[PDB]
Amino acid sequence: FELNINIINYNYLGIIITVIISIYIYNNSNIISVYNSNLLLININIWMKYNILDMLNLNVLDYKILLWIVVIIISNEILLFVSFYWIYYHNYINYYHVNILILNSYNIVYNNIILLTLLSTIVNIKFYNYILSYYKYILSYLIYYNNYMFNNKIILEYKNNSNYTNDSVYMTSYFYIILLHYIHIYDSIILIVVYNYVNYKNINNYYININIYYHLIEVLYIVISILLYL
Amino acid sequence: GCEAVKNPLIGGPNQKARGAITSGFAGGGAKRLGGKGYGIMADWCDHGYSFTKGQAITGMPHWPLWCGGGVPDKFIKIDPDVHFNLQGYRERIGWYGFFTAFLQANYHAFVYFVRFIPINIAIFWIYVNERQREPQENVMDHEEFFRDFDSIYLGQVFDHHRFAEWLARRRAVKWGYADQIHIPPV
Amino acid sequence: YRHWHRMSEDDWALPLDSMPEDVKTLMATPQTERGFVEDYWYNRIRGEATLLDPEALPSKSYIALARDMGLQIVDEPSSHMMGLIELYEYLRGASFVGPFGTIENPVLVPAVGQERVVACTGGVGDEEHFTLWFRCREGFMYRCGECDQIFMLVRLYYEDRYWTQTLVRDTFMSDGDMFDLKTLERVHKMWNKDEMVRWEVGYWAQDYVLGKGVLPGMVEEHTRVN
Amino acid sequence: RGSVFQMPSTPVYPLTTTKKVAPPTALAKRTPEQPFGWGSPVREDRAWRVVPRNFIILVIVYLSGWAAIKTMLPRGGSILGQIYGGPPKGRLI
Amino acid sequence: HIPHPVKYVGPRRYGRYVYGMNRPPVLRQVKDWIDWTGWNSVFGGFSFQVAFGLMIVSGVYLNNYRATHTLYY
Amino acid sequence: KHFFTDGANDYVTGWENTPPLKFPASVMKPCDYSMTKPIPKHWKLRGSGIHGPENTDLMKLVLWNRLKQKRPQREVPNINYLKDSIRLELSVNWWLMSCIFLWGPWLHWGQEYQKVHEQPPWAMKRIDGLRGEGYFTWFLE
Amino acid sequence: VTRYPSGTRTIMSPYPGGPVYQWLRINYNYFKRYQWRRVGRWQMRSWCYWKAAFYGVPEWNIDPTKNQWRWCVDPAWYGGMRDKANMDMYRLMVYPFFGYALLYLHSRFKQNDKYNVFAKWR
Amino acid sequence: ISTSETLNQKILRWLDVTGMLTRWHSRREFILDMDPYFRKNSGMWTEWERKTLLFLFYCCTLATPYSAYLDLQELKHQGTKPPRPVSLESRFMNQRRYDFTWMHPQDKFCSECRPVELECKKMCFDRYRSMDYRMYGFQRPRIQTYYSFSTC
Amino acid sequence: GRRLLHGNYFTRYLFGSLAVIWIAEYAAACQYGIPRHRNPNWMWSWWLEKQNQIKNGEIPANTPGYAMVKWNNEAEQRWLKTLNVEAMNEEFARRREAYY
Amino acid sequence: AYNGGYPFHYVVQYDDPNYDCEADFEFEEIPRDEFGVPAHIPPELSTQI
């Protein structure tokens, strides 16, 4: 027989990661922060390596445990956006009569909605192929093109906007809510860059996580679009 | 230090006597180059699929999970008795060998960076390309705008080519290089 | 069981590359001296040699037929040991529910060691009480202080070892007549002729008996690039 | 060979048509000095030599180029500034 | 989940494609495809945009035309 | 379905609480001995009596759940199952079609009208002298 | 029935097509299968994130009793000397970090004029 | 022109120049278009799954050009954004407690300019250049550079 | 295959919630008697009268609001020094002739 | 009734003895099933046979 769980006795990434966090506080140059971020990325990858190596234990509950962890993380991301919506709507009584130019409801909203919908369709096709034990090379490069356009559009919008964060709480909330969504789009790039075909298929937690996360980002933008643009 | 470090090899005889295993490559047993084999067959070099040659070097990974199984003894190259038993390992590889071991321990991190940098370079190019250009005329005088509201506010939709040329001339006047540039006619 | 993961490819069959190359010694090794891989191929080579000889099957007794395929004839001792093994394995990830324990029929608590923690929850319905945990050690008839339910520890122990499927086989299975390599050759020629190999394990096995790389195409079969 | 679930439709073994001598690993057996891997030919381990060599070269080029820019070129806000951030030619300051 | 039969009642096979001969009209083919893959996805997908579009474009009459003709001052 | 559930959508291990309906009850049946008739007093307990593999039905359930994992061909599900598996995918695709062919045309029409008349076609025209497009979603005014 | 090479002959029309059409059909088929898919095959095989996770891990023995390193050794050190070397390298940075961290405290302490506590009132 | 085919056949042929329609109507053509490793699993697919996958795939790819057209128009719109009236500094507008330095804690470039206030930075970079300190950007006319989306 | 939520849960609880919100709001308006006619205009009576005068032609077209008030702030005094409504109207008239 | 009807393990056969789905990048071979059904015969038809 064997123990139900193969215990993990020792770990040293925790110390390294925690020290990396402290380096952000104790920096005397923003250049150190940039290089420190690479270290954090490296060590987080090692932690992800340990999760993949745990497959050797053949434990049925490992998939379930990680899936429910992601559910909790998703909830935290939703509640973080709720706080920004809370901040935005608290000062609702002070909006729409101040001498600032709010965003148009015709151009930005439509193309972004169309663009992000295509992103969902690409990920949906990836899920379908994952169900069918099949792969299509071009799909990943469609995501990169999709992400390239999103970055190009958002950069221009910020640069050409004629109002600034210090003009009103409305502008601050607009910029902040849009940035928060962008950061979650960038986190999606971090995840999707490693998409590959793995032959153990439906016992791979990465596929279900990516599908859930991409759907969350897109639905959040619908709420943002209704609140700010429409 | 040890013989293995001096003469690195993959899966030769007398591994225990040589003192160390310097290769992370695991598996083999393919009848042809790039064919079906055993083990995962991953390494820094000589694996996967050559883009330059358009040929497969090793087969798809054969995981020890449900989808695969163990590797026959004929083709096992990382003997755990030599792979582990790390007592005295730093003397068997020396300082330089210690440096190589540290670099090779981060193959997982290296693979991610290769797949992660290029899109960031694309995003960075957008910023660099735009930063070179002079900024667009974001705002103008409050009163002058309203005295010609229709032309300025609706000019773009009615005729974007003439409107674009008009913007260029204003930028030339604003930054004082109108006489130095020839704006094409529209 | 529900707590096991997906069947691996090896759970069905092993690759021929795992066949021991010294087949002549493999077929002469006693069962107690054969490892997991050696035992697997001994049974498969000997089992398929008898099954691929149709003309001899009808005259072969079930005892001999079971021996050739490596199947163990069941008896009360072996059945008892195997049954308690499966019960132990099932309880690893399943609930422990059964009839109320009494002196005549104590609750059986399988264990490998000398001790295992148990809880008593009383009887059914109103007789059910709060969990009362106790350490069930070997050699004592335990009596719950609340409901008077009787528990007993059953140890899966045998001669300095704990019961396992292989241990049961070695203890009770008896090696029969030594396998004759002539049968391997005779069946090999029956199903393998003129480049057609419908009996491939025997083809490899016969090649190993003749050394290695003697039969047609075996040199190319054993040559690998990595 | 690969998985046991992939097989030819017609099970046929080619009758050797060439006279090529058998490779040593094709006839090798397990030996006390080689308990594992006797079926696979020995190969050079390039990763042990190339990885540290390539890493050193990239670091040297990376650091050397960074040092050269900050020394040969005039002071500037960023590397791109020091290369293209100067005033137009003929603009006296 | 309530077990229930498959509601598709159209043709199950058109036959081998032979340069597009002996095949139904295009509109009938579109109807068959949606029957095969389910109308529930069509209605669900289009429901949101139809509701939003009708509400916005209804204002052309409800908000613009009626208001001009109905202002007591 | 996307999400994994131990009870119903258990694709990680493929465990099923009951056998297929194809098998005759004699061959295999669901593990239910709730209807067992009272045991005669003269019968004696030989086995543990503990719920587990000693019961024939549970043993066959465990055996089948392991041996079903290799099958010669696919067990084709009906179109209802296949529809449900990609319900979200199909609906998102139709949502994209609706955006292109329904939202796009009238949004383009509104902007063109706005160009000529200073306000969207679904808005009351102002008489207060303020300039600009004004609101878009009229019913939220 | 004549079987053409896959992707080279259309089934939509009895006419194979004109020279330009045939060139486009044949060459797209070649570009996809033998030129564009090089990139995909290269990324899938030579740069697999999951393969890189098992790099340096011992082969899995078919004999079940020869894999005891799975539970005898913690997963963080399945890589032998590589995993230990990576751990040892970060250990060397402990004291360099302390000096670096101590400098930051000095920097803040100085910038707040806390060293002039006695000189201020002398 | 070719009279060996109907008009419908000709239209279908050209829409099939990349083989999309042929793969849709032939299972054999579809599976052979897969790479060998994945063709191994093709036998298990039902026709409902195969054609449904293509439908989702074709709708996505066919819609990508439309999104590209929208994005290009968006880039052109931003490339020639009309100027807007200068904001009157109202009661609660442009309030500052400290300079903007979070981007450059040590260098403190353009402390008075906001993080993405390009025109303010341009004039600030000009001062630094006039002080013999190089800075990158804002020097090339927009119509003389590539990818500006501002050309006539 | 076992279901946890309503078979049409997403559409049911989105459109259903919107319907209930809309119907509740109408009920609330009826109870309090709130006027439901929509006005998109500012209600400053004096300003609306001036706008009507411009529409009638009593006040020349394109005349700024600060040109019509009895108190001007400093910024408006700056603009009044450069204001020429007559010139603006002539320029617009010239544009119309060129267009036609 | 598990995994959408896809078995975890199944047999695949190839007509060419020297065929390797990982080494070759050809586009003519059609894999067969355990019963020998070619892959371009869909399962809803082959399962009825």
Ligand SMILES: CCCCCCCCCCCCCCCCCC(=O)OC[C@H](COP(=O)([O-])OCC(O)COP(=O)([O-])OC[C@@H](COC(=O)CCCCCCCCCCCCCCCCC)OC(=O)CCCCCCCCCCCCCCCCC)OC(=O)CCCCCCCCCCCCCCCCC
């Ligand atoms: C006489 C010739 C007439 C030609 C007319 C023009 C036709 C152009 C079609 C372009 C379609 C691009 C669609 C992009 C989305 C991704 C597609 C995809 O999934 O590809 C998978 C495909 C194969 O992927 P895989 O993973 O191997 O296989 C996956 C599947 O299993 C198997 O995949 P699959 O085989 O099912 O793929 C189906 C299909 C799925 O996608 C579609 O079917 C979408 C179709 C959309 C149509 C868009 C037309 C745009 C035209 C606009 C023109 C505007 C003019 C304005 C004028 C203004 C005047 C004032 O994908 C493709 O076929 C993609 C195109 C393949 C070409 C690759 C070679 C390089 C480009 C060659 C271009 C040649 C143009 C010649 C023009 C001559 C004119 C006389 O990917 C590749 O081949 C690799 C990447 C390259 C693909 C994209 C190439 C873009 C080329 C654009 C050309 C048009 C430019 C117009 C500019 C106008 C400026 C004003």
Ligand SMILES: CCCCCCCCCCCCCCCCCC(=O)OC[C@H](COP(=O)([O-])OCC(O)COP(=O)([O-])OC[C@@H](COC(=O)CCCCCCCCCCCCCCCCC)OC(=O)CCCCCCCCCCCCCCCCC)OC(=O)CCCCCCCCCCCCCCCCC
């Ligand atoms: C035709 C073909 C042509 C081909 C041409 C090819 C040309 C190739 C050229 C290659 C060379 C490039 C050189 C430049 C590279 C960039 C360097 C740089 O400046 O980066 C930072 C740069 C900003 O820096 P900067 O302002 O330029 O430099 C200011 C100076 O640092 C001013 O100094 P500061 O004092 O203000 O700085 C504060 C100081 C703060 O210093 C301190 O606090 C320490 C001071 C005392 C230390 C004394 C020792 C005591 C012990 C210390 C212990 C420390 C550790 C303690 C524990 C942890 C906590 C600290 O910070 C530092 O020291 C900075 C470095 C710190 C170390 C970071 C790690 C670096 C490792 C790199 C190598 C890897 C490891 C090697 C291991 C070797 C083993 C054998 O930031 C960025 O790069 C931001 C943008 C992001 C990257 C963009 C990439 C764009 C790529 C464009 C590609 C174009 C492709 C075109 C294709 C076209 C196709 C047609």
Ligand SMILES: CCCCCCCCCCCCCCCCCC(=O)OC[C@H](COP(=O)([O-])OCC(O)COP(=O)([O-])OC[C@@H](COC(=O)CCCCCCCCCCCCCCCCC)OC(=O)CCCCCCCCCCCCCCCCC)OC(=O)CCCCCCCCCCCCCCCCC
């Ligand atoms: C007006 C126009 C504009 C509208 C804008 C709308 C904006 C919406 C924003 C939404 C953002 C995106 C979020 C979802 C992203 C993923 C989408 C996705 O993949 O969907 C397809 C996919 C469909 O799954 P499937 O298995 O294929 O289903 C097939 C069939 O649909 C049939 O499936 P089935 O029925 O057979 O059931 C299977 C499936 C069915 O489930 C689903 O499919 C879920 C679909 C959800 C879609 C989102 C709809 C909106 C939900 C609103 C919930 C509000 C909560 C209450 C807030 C109160 C505030 C005061 O089950 C699961 O997948 C289980 C998932 C785990 C659920 C964990 C829930 C934890 C929280 C429990 C409540 C806590 C409060 C207790 C209070 C009482 C205490 C006594 O969904 C998933 O698989 C997603 C599951 C993973 C993400 C779960 C996230 C849970 C977050 C919990 C937050 C709790 C906060 C509590 C405190 C709050 C107050 C302080």
Ligand SMILES: CCCCCCCCCCCCCCCCCC(=O)OC[C@H](COP(=O)([O-])OCC(O)COP(=O)([O-])OC[C@@H](COC(=O)CCCCCCCCCCCCCCCCC)OC(=O)CCCCCCCCCCCCCCCCC)OC(=O)CCCCCCCCCCCCCCCCC
């Ligand atoms: C004499 C005077 C005469 C006067 C005559 C006047 C005439 C007036 C006529 C008025 C007519 C009124 C009619 C009323 C009765 C309606 C009856 C009806 O059919 O109701 C039900 C009908 C449909 O409900 P249903 O029957 O439940 O739907 C059946 C489904 O198939 C259920 O099946 P299912 O549940 O399987 O459905 C599929 C489902 C299956 O679910 C799953 O597969 C499982 C997973 C579900 C959870 C998903 C989680 C998240 C997914 C992530 C992926 C996202 C992708 C997109 C990403 C975008 C990124 C930007 O999946 C989905 O549907 C969701 C996924 C698809 C994509 C979702 C996209 C985002 C949605 C959320 C945002 C929505 C707002 C967007 C706004 C725009 C953009 C910002 O409801 C409506 O249509 C709503 C009623 C609207 C009433 C409007 C009334 C006002 C307007 C009046 C206009 C006319 C006035 C003209 C003037 C007249 C003056 C006199």
Ligand SMILES: CCCCCCCCCCCCCCCCCC(=O)OC[C@H](COP(=O)([O-])OCC(O)COP(=O)([O-])OC[C@@H](COC(=O)CCCCCCCCCCCCCCCCC)OC(=O)CCCCCCCCCCCCCCCCC)OC(=O)CCCCCCCCCCCCCCCCC
């Ligand atoms: C912003 C403005 C608007 C922009 C819109 C942009 C739209 C982009 C759409 C792109 C669609 C791509 C379609 C590809 C079709 C491929 C078939 C084809 O044509 O193959 C022919 C042929 C095939 O030969 P083959 O295969 O050997 O056949 C021999 C067989 O024996 C015989 O076999 P066969 O008979 O089957 O082969 C021949 C057959 C082949 O074709 C077919 O039968 C077609 C069947 C499939 C059709 C499926 C649909 C295709 C997509 C339709 C897209 C519609 C776009 C609508 C846009 C509206 C915009 C308002 O028939 C044809 O060749 C007929 C071609 C019809 C072309 C129609 C062109 C319409 C242009 C409209 C312009 C409007 C401008 C308005 C300006 C307003 C200003 C206020 O080879 C080529 O494709 C030739 C390529 C070389 C062309 C050279 C062109 C030189 C142009 C010089 C211009 C100089 C300008 C100077 C200016 C100076 C100023 C001062």
Ligand SMILES: CCCCCCCC/C=C/CCCCCCCC(=O)OC[C@H](COP(=O)(O)OCCN)OC(=O)CCCCCCC/C=C/CCCCCCCC
């Ligand atoms: C015997 C009876 C026959 C009757 C025949 C009736 C035929 C009716 C044909 C109606 C055609 C209507 C076409 C409308 C197209 C409008 C396209 C348009 O506006 O494109 C722009 C817009 C994007 O522009 P942006 O600048 O980005 O602005 C919006 C976002 N910012 O793009 C789109 O709208 C793309 C979507 C195209 C929609 C096409 C609609 C086609 C409708 C055809 C109906 C045919 C009916 C036939 C009935 C037959 C009865 C026997």
Ligand SMILES: CCCCCCCC/C=C\CCCCCCCC(=O)OC[C@H](COP(=O)(O)OCCN)OC(=O)CCCCCCC/C=C/CCCCCCCC
């Ligand atoms: C190889 C190089 C690759 C580079 C490109 C690819 C990688 C890109 C990575 C993701 C980048 C995401 C950037 C997110 C921050 C964006 C900042 C931004 O835009 O801020 C401005 C925007 C609007 O401002 P205005 O200029 O007034 O707008 C007027 C419009 N004309 O919003 C703000 O001002 C808010 C700024 C919030 C910034 C938050 C980012 C985190 C910064 C943390 C600094 C901490 C320093 C202290 C020490 C601790 C170090 C950890």
Ligand SMILES: [Zn+2]
């Ligand atoms: Zn008790």
